[PDB]
Design a protein around this nucleic acid. Structure first.
Ligand SMILES: [Ca+2]
Ligand SMILES: [Ca+2]
Length: 1203
RNA sequence: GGGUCCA
RNA sequence: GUGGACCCA
């Protein structure tokens, strides 16, 4: 100690200056009050001056209204908590009134008039707070809306009332328009932007006034959008602001909007990789049951809470044991996850979103400065969110030469807490240092441990899920013949023993029952423990008195509620939520555990618009009861999509349309478009004409046209469309053609596998002279395969990958194709495969019944081209259960050769690269699946594998033609693994071609028989393929064009030239709407038409029912409606702030489901899943329902979004 | 149930 | 109307 401390808190409470910054300045005035302060005044600017080194990208915005002179101010700081402070408001409420009266529209004027208080402030706070900008709006009737404090707008109108300026101020806050009229545009900005585009599209070789009308149309919609005028009114997006305005009378001279910290770089901040770099700079010189406790550090930005967080880890490592960005560490007794609370809003989001709640906070203030004036906003954050327990660490105590002075800081931080109803008298407060503790100084290393001591004692052990009252969200209800009623779900809390009493509460009059049983797919047990996906048996309750969403809990544990208060976070745009604010009416659906449910909300006191990105307390009244108590998380669901998330805060008490319009559309949908002859052919031909190309003159050409592989990308795109568009059309009369050609083709693939099964058995040329590229490739192939695949199929994979999913089996048919029909009806099963079925049966109590026991499968003919059908095979369904088994273990393995079979997307970018680069080729094989002979599979696969594969295979075929085949091919499509098997066989083969050439095997990528690989291999690969069976289609394999195709995408020199197809005769408005959308998609570039096609589109649009010509949807919403603008759509019944648009569905009649098969299918899936801002967790998978498709259409209303 | 998609 | 992807109702 040096100077008396008692009258230092006097020197301080008069300023707000830091303790030690206030004591060492009283140690140079001899104990002089009014002098010690003056040393500080003229020294506090040496502080605020070394503040330019702190980015100030947070802050607030303000607006004042003097009859009709208005001013908008944006002074920013660098933290959430400061901008919502007591004193920071005071400075900007002040500096906003120096703008009103003394009308200032220069920024430098007040940035100096105040330049004192600004520095006398930061000394008080400690964050770089500069006034950032100001400007005023000169106009007649002007209004100003402010959205919280984050954003403020300024509107100067003319002829509009008290509402009309608020409202168009509210749109401005939402839609941030750069200009006011579609004409307020730098002739240059739109002169460069027209000349930048007028080449772009001329590049592809579009003709002048085509690229021109196209360019122009774009920079029409461009300026339309950025300009207030041509922006859909946000409170009625049917009409623009242009129309909103004029329609009334008025006109706005102009507007202003600032948003806090706009265009402020703000270099990013991590945490884990942040601490690890404070740790490492000094980090050099069984019992899994332990509870998991989340904590968060929350203090002043530079009271070094990043330093205290490091020590907690280097010193808890140096002692005891060993979502995104969150350091964790261990105690002998507990396991801790440590978050940082660097923003108030930001944290609240992560509390609601669920992506990091808190079991105890820890407040980090430095004794050098004591509590910061904004420290109340920290304790406040905790109070609001309700972090139950707050511990305090006093940092940098070494740097204090009087202990009496610490007793004085504690006193402060101890009272501040209790002002916010935190136990501030009995609240643990440690004195220590973080820097020192890193330096290896145990005198201070102890205080870190001490802190850890308090996490282990003060913060209470969070009640293990297992220990709370029983509760299982009902997912689906079955009526099982002689097992009564049964529900399936994941028991979320507690435990249920057989025999116990349960309530089924939720949507109707909370009912009760008693538990008859508990069972999984394998084990049937007598208790369901938390976290387990089970099925619960009930008695004395028909399965029609239970719905999904309902729960099932220990009686009185939980109760059905309708009205509650909450806090929700609304998903921003860039997180795929709304992109349009809502207001008073909002009427979304609330997803609870397992089902949506509708409700109205009521914004709190004084809000009236909400945007994507805002947290918000709101009050929610549901359509009907859900079982709920405080803490229950529920997502906000806007027909299909999640737009918001939110948690129940307090459970309160308990308090458009068009039928003969859907009727009109329904009637039309079911109408039948009708014309003379080949409507499809006609569209194709008029299209060719509209692009300047000789139309087809006979149906014979449509499927016999050869494209030219040169020409600008535009002379080609059409040529290619011309060649491919009609190719797949099943309706061509002109053909001596049949599906007998499909069989003949089938019969050849066999003659093929014949030769190659013999060829591949006889590698004894004569002597040892000559060597075959073929022979060696299968030799290299073999080894790669075996090192990748393994000895033989694990069971770990085998069982976790076997499933039913599909359609027709040998004993089921398309109608009974759904997996639950494979569980209900006994399934055939080849002899060789019987053991696996038994093995399955041997590991489950449920009857696994095998019907027939034959080696036979059914070959059939699905329509395809108009020149050939497709041959397929329907496998014995118990075979197919396991074929999908291994097919999925293969798919999974195949990912280490970087082949990823659920993403033809990677196989189609390389499609496109190879098309500019000309180094990758794309290969096409003809009948692939039909050519993979047994000989080949054996030679390449482990014998281990080649057996399971032999087992699971169907070996003989039975045809429609009554007869029989013994398969030469190891397998054909239809089989549950034939597709990965080709992938594997093909990839391996190709990589071995690569290795033989010093080529990089990384360059082989494969999907089915869509092979991509370095262009120089192709001739080797070709020669290999010829040898081992496969027959390579030169016409469609491209190792040198400007053109490559792969996985449905086609490219010419980087330009997308993928066409569209008219497969069937066009006859429904449904059918035609389709073609018109494929035409639309193929000739639009961001809603802007190529003139030449827009013509042919427009023409044919007229063939549809009037109502249906104007009923339009956005893209990515299917083909139940013409894609166009959904704001022009006159049927777009907006309803509760969310646009519902009607679309044509395929009308279906509901059908009886197989309760047991549906129920096994249910349990077998929960099994399957166990042995194998992001918040989708709150969204399960659907109850099995069945429906026969009828030939009629229906109209379904669905939810859409403006863009 | 719908559409692309490799067979 | 088998088998796979993927967006969609
Ligand atoms: Ca092919
Ligand atoms: Ca291909």
């Amino acid at each position: 100690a040096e100077i008396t401390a008692s009258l230092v808190k006097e020197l301080r409470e008069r300023t707000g200056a830091g303790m030690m910054d206030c004591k060492k300045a009283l140690t140079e005035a001899n104990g002089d009050i009014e002098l010690a302060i003056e040393n500080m005044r003229k020294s506090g600017a040496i502080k605020a001056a070394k503040k330019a080194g702190n980015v100030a990208a947070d802050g607030v915005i303000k607006t004042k209204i003097d009859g009709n002179y208005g001013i908008i101010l944006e002074v920013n700081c660098q933290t959430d908590f400061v901008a919502k402070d007591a004193g920071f408001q005071a400075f900007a409420d002040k500096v906003l009134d120096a703008a009103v009266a003394g009308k200032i529209t220069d920024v430098e004027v007040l940035k100096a008039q105040f330049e004192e208080e600004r520095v006398a402030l930061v000394a008080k706070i400690g964050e770089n707070i500069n006034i950032r900008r100001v400007a005023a709006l000169e106009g007649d009737v002007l209004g100003s809306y402010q959205h919280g404090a984050r954003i403020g707008v300024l509107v100067a109108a003319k002829g509009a009332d008290e509402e009309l300026v608020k409202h168009i101020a509210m749109h401005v806050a939402a839609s941030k328009p750069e200009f006011i009229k579609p004409e307020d545009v730098s002739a240059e900005v739109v002169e460069k932007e027209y000349q930048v585009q007028l080449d772009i599209a001329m590049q592809s070789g579009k003709p002048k006034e085509i690229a021109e009308k196209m360019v122009e149309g774009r920079m029409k919609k461009f300026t339309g959008e950025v300009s207030l005028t041509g922006q859909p009114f946000v409170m009625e997006p049917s009409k623009t602001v242009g129309q909103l305005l004029k329609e009334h009378n008025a006109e706005v001279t102009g507007f202003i909007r600032f948003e806090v910290g706009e265009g402020i770089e703000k270099v990013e901040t991590d945490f884990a990789a942040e601490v690890a770099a404070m740790s490492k700079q000094s980090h050099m010189s069984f019992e899994r049951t332990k509870p998991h406790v989340n904590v968060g550090t929350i203090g002043h930005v530079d009271h070094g809470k990043t330093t205290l967080t490091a020590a907690i880890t280097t010193v808890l490592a140096k002692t005891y044991g060993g979502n995104t960005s969150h350091v964790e560490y261990d105690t002998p007794t507990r396991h801790y996850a440590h978050v940082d609370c660097p923003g108030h809003a930001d944290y609240v989001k992560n509390m609601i979103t669920g992506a990091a709640q808190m079991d105890g906070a820890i407040l980090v203030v430095a004794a050098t400065d004591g509590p910061m004036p904004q420290t109340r906003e920290h304790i406040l954050l905790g109070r609001q969110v309700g972090v139950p327990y707050i511990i305090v660490f006093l940092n940098k105590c070494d740097m204090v030469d009087d202990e009496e002075l610490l007793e004085l800081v504690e006193m402060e931080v101890r009272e501040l807490l209790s002002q916010y109803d935190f136990p501030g008298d009995d609240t643990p407060i440690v004195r220590g240092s973080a820097l020192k503790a890193l330096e290896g100084d145990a005198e201070w290393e102890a205080k870190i441990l001490e802190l850890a001591g308090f996490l282990d004692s003060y913060i209470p052990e969070p009640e293990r899920a297992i220990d709370k009252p029983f509760l299982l969200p009902i997912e689906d209800v079955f009526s099982i013949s002689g097992r009564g009623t049964v529900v399936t779900g994941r028991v979320e809390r507690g435990i249920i023993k057989v025999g116990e009493e349960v309530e089924i509460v939720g949507i109707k009059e909370t009912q009760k029952s008693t538990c008859t049983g508990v069972e999984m797919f394998r084990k049937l047990l007598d208790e369901g423990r938390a976290g387990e996906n089970v099925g619960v048996l009930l008695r004395g309750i028909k399965r029609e008195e239970i719905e999904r969403g309902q729960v099932l809990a220990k009686p009185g544990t939980i109760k059905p509620h309708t009205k509650f208060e909450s806090e929700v976070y609304i998903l921003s745009k860039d997180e795929g939520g709304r992109h349009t604010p809502f207001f008073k009416g909002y009427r979304p659906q609330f997803y609870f555990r397992t089902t949506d449910v509708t409700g109205t909300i009521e914004l709190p006191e004084g809000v009236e618009m909400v945007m994507p990105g805002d947290n918000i307390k709101m009050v929610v009244t549901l359509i009907h009861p859900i079982a709920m108590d405080d803490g229950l998380r529920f997502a906000i669901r806007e027909g299909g999509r999640t737009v918001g998330a939110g948690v129940v805060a307090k459970v309160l008490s308990g308090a458009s349309s068009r039928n003969s319009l859907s009727a009109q559309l329904r009637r039309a949908a079911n109408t039948r478009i009708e014309v003379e002859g080949n409507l499809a052919l006609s569209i194709a031909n008029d299209l060719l004409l509209a692009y300047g190309q000789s139309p087809f003159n006979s149906e014979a050409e449509c499927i016999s046209f050869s494209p030219r592989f040169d020409g600008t990308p535009d002379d080609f795109r059409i040529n290619y469309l011309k060649a491919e568009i009609m190719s797949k059309y099943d309706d061509f009369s002109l053909g001596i053609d049949t599906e007998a050609v499909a069989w003949e083709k089938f019969l050849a693939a066999e003659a093929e596998c014949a030769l190659t099964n013999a060829r591949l058995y006889r590698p004894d040329y004569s002597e040892d002279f000559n060597f075959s590229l073929g022979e060696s490739c299968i030799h290299m192939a073999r080894r790669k395969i075996a090192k990748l695949i393994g000895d033989v199929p694990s069971v770990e994979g085998m069982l976790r990958h076997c499933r039913f999913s599909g359609g027709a089996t040998t004993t089921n048919n398309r109608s009974y194709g759904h997996p639950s029909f494979k569980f209900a009806l006994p399934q055939a099963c080849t002899p060789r495969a019987l053991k696996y079925v038994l093995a399955l049966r041997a590991s489950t109590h449920f009857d696994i019944r095998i019907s027939d026991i034959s080696p036979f499968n059914k070959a059939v003919t699905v329509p395809k081209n108009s020149k050939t059908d497709r041959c397929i095979a329907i496998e014995p369904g118990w075979n197919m259960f396991f074929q999908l088994g291994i097919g999925g273990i293969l798919r999974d393995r195949l990912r280490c050769w970087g082949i990823d079979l659920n993403d033809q997307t990677i196989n189609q970018r390389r499609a496109h690269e190879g098309s500019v680069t000309n180094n990758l080729a794309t290969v096409d094989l003809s009948a692939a699946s039909d050519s993979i002979s047994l000989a080949l599979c054996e030679l390449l696969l482990p014998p281990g594998w080649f057996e399971v594969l032999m087992d699971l295979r169907s070996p003989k075929g039975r045809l429609p033609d009554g007869s029989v085949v013994t398969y030469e091919k190891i397998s054909s499509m239809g089989n549950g693994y034939t597709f990965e098997l080709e992938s594997l066989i093909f990839a391996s083969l190709a990589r071995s071609v690569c290795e033989i050439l010093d080529l990089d095997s990384s360059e082989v990528t494969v999907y089915g028989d869509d092979i991509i690989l370095p262009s120089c291999a192709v001739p080797a690969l070709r020669e290999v393929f010829k040898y081992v069976g496969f027959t390579t289609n030169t016409k469609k394999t491209f190792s040198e064009g400007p053109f490559r195709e792969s996985c449905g995408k086609h490219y010419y020199s980087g330009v997308d030239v993928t066409p569209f197809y008219i497969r069937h005769r066009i006859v429904s408005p449904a059918d035609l709407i389709l073609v018109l959308n494929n035409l639309y998609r193929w000739a639009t570039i961001d809603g802007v038409w190529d003139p030449r096609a827009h013509s042919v589109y427009l023409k044919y649009r007229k063939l549809l029912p009037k109502q249906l010509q104007r009923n339009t949807i956005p893209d990515g919403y299917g083909d139940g409606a013409l894609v166009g603008s959904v704001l022009i759509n006159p049927f777009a019944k907006n309803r509760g702030w969310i646009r519902y648009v009607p679309v044509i569905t395929d009308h279906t009649r509901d059908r009886e489901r197989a309760e047991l098969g549906s129920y096994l299918y249910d349990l077998f899936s929960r099994c399957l899943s166990e042995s194998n801002a992001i918040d989708q967790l709150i969204c399960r998978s659907n109850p099995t329902k069945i429906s026969r498709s009828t030939g009629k259409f229906d109209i379904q209303y669905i939810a859409c979004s403006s863009r």
